[PDB]
């Protein structure tokens, strides 16, 4: 049996739920103490246990609050979320890609041993809107070791990710006019190697700032693609293969997987 699973057998609405099982608390990181990134809020589970980590990385302009609901959520399913401000609001995506390293460094090495007890930290993970997005991807062909990456309506002038051996899920939202699918998120999908696991996700009438706003789907299939493969836990395949519907009257514009991984 797998030694990750962690939480109940889940369901769709256990899923689409504002709040998973778990009782979730917060740290607090410094800006001058986050080296090599600006600060943030460190969520994890309450009950005590190893989990997955992930580091979450805001867009342009943006700080941690634009994120904080995806992290607080993700945690209350059972791992351990760093929600990151950036050195400056201005950093591009290559930036953002050191940054996240840099958060990712810092729960493991650096937080109180109240987080560090409950990170399992062969098993990592890494998030972001936007540029923070762009600098998922960069990260993730940085770091062949992390078990997943979703970037959330990702923004990079970089459009080849062949490098990328990370299970991965874009994010996209059909009516994104500042990083539009069409020249943003299709295009990386399209360069991941086939060979992968990954998956393209388009939001239904959902703009590039759907991901600031509690959002049903983001946090359903975030959670599910971490747990199957943060987690390895394969009670989450059923919400990936075939996954969402995106058919006329669907659930998504679009989704494409190289299920069955
Ligand atoms: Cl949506
Ligand atoms: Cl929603």
Redesign the pocket.
């Not at 706003?213 to 946090?219: E, F, L, Q, R, V």
């Given at each position: 049996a797998n030694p990750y699973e962690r939480g109940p057998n889940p369901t769709d609405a256990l899923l689409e739920a504002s709040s998973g099982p778990f009782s979730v608390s917060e740290e607090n990181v410094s800006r001058l103490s986050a080296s090599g990134f600006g600060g943030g809020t460190i969520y994890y589970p309450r009950e005590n246990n190893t989990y997955g980590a992930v580091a979450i990385s805001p867009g342009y302009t943006g700080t941690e609050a634009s994120i904080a609901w995806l992290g607080e959520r993700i945690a209350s399913h059972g791992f351990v979320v760093i929600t990151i401000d950036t050195i400056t609001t201005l950093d591009q995506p290559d930036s953002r890609a050191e940054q996240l390293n840099a958060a990712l460094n810092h729960m493991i090495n650096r937080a109180s041993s109240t987080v560090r007890s409950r990170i399992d930290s062969s098993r990592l993970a890494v998030m972001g809107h936007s540029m923070g997005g762009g600098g998922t991807l960069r990260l993730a062909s940085q770091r062949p070791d992390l078990k997943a990456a979703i970037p959330l309506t990702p923004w990079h002038l970089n459009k080849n990710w062949s490098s990328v051996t990370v299970p991965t899920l874009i994010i996209g939202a059909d009516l994104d006019t500042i990083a539009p699918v069409a020249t943003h998120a299709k295009p990386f999908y399209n360069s991941l190697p086939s060979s992968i696991s990954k998956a393209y996700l388009e939001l239904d009438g959902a703009t590039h700032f759907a991901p600031n706003?509690?959002?049903?789907?983001?946090?359903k299939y975030s959670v599910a693609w971490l747990k199957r493969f943060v987690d390895n836990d394969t009670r989450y395949t059923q919400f990936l293969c075939p996954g969402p519907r995106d058919g006329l009257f669907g659930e998504v514009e679009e989704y494409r997987s190289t299920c069955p991984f």
């Open positions: 706003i509690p959002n049903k789907i983001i946090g």
